[model samples]
Target: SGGHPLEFLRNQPQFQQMRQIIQQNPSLLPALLQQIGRENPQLLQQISQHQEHFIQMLNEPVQEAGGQGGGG
Candidate 1:
């Protein structure tokens, strides 16, 4: 059985804020997820079930930074 825990927070202002921030800065998704995991393990577990897409999105930031050479 699969259910979305996100729906539990759909009416929460804090969740809305998280969504807004993540939308503006996809790289922050990990940070937000970590915080959520600490505060709500059940929700995090549900999220983890669908984390493949999240990991893919996170790769963009890593790749972008890695592609740029450091200035000496």
Candidate 2:
């Protein structure tokens, strides 16, 4: 659930590239999803909803992209 650091990520741009590719084509979702199923079979429905919500939260800069700069 955690992404690598930016420097580490720069060294492995494939992670970002893979995400972009997956965003364009969603078929790969189930493969990654299997990890959750393996961990908790009973929570599949709720967990699946979390998957989408998590993606949305990830889009938030505080969660994924560069954070806001400067002090108030």
Candidate 3:
């Protein structure tokens, strides 16, 4: 049977935590949007259309200079 639109995402780490945080902080969404830029639909739609690429870029491995690696 089909389930909720975000049922799979609920199992992700901190997913519910983020949901609760947003619920508790009612102004966070609007505040963030306003801080970034209000009424920016074109960029928003572009990002949504290419969300896979955006997420890939956002989650790219963070490399430090000199390539020493962590715990060195």
User: Quick one: best TM-score, which candidate?
Assistant: 1
C-alpha-based local distance difference test score of model 2: 0.40
Which ten residues in a row are the worst by lDDT in model 3? 63-72
Error of 2 at 62 (Å): 9.0
Best by lDDT: 1
The digit string of per-residue lDDT tens for model 3 on 1-72 reads: 112223343343323333333344533443433422444555444444554443333233322222222122
Clashing pairs in 2: none
Cα lDDT listed for each candidate = 0.54, 0.40, 0.36
TM-score of 2: 0.33
Candidate 2: list runs displaced more than 4 Å. 1-27, 58-72
Model 1 residue runs over 4 Å out of place are: 5-8, 52-72
Candidate 3: segments with Cα more than 4 A from true spot: 1-39, 62-72
TM per prediction? 0.54, 0.33, 0.32
Across residues 1-72, which tens digit of lDDT does each residue of candidate 2 receive? 223223332233333332443444445556534644675564444546556643443233332222221111
* Candidate 1 TM-score, C-alpha based: 0.54
Cα misplacement distance, residue 12 of candidate 3 (Å): 29
Root-mean-square deviation of candidate 3: 13.3
| lDDT for position 64 in model 2 | 27
